[PDB]
Design a protein around this ligand. Structure first.
Ligand SMILES: *[C@@H]1O[C@H](CO)[C@@H](O)[C@H](O)[C@H]1NC(C)=O
Lengths: 48, 48, 48
């Protein structure tokens, strides 16, 4: 019930981006596929 | 004037070959399905 | 539920989280947890 509310102020009209405006929620934020950013090598001290 | 009246067309053995319904064609019988038809429902629930 | 307290007794609080079974009303309203809703809480002392 608290991971559902819109993430202010990203639901405002003062958002220059358009993509995050409609999915600026908590549940849909668990995937970075739609955010287009990716990591190079997420290994931990060389331990995988 | 109808509750004790034969109900068409299940009276005719020629028309309907199932003898149980023909014997129990009386509309009085429909209430006593627990003792005439022995079919029950899973639960008397309704919308939780 | 109920809460216990009195003028004579001293400070207390539970570290853990009291748990309540609330399945039936959600099934009644046909409202999944992810849907839109809220709670309303009322507290009333024993003396009225
Ligand atoms: C009931 O008890 C509460 C305890 O805080 C008190 O504030 C209130 O005045 C009491 N009311 C009556 C009618 O006894």
């Amino acid at each position: 019930q608290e991971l559902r509310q819109p993430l202010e102020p990203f639901n405002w009209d003062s958002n220059p981006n358009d993509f995050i405006r409609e999915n600026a929620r908590a549940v849909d934020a668990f995937d970075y596929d739609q955010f287009n950013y990716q990591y190079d090598d997420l290994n931990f001290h060389g331990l995988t | 004037n109808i509750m004790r009246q034969p109900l068409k067309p299940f009276n005719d053995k020629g028309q309907n070959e199932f003898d149980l319904t023909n014997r129990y064609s009386r509309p009085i019988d429909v209430f006593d399905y627990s003792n005439h038809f022995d079919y029950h429902y899973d639960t008397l629930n309704f919308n939780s | 539920f109920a809460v216990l307290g009195g003028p004579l007794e001293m400070d207390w609080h539970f570290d853990r989280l009291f748990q309540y079974d609330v399945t039936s009303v959600f099934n009644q309203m046909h409202l999944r947890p992810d849907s839109v809703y809220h709670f309303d809480v009322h507290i009333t002392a024993i003396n009225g």
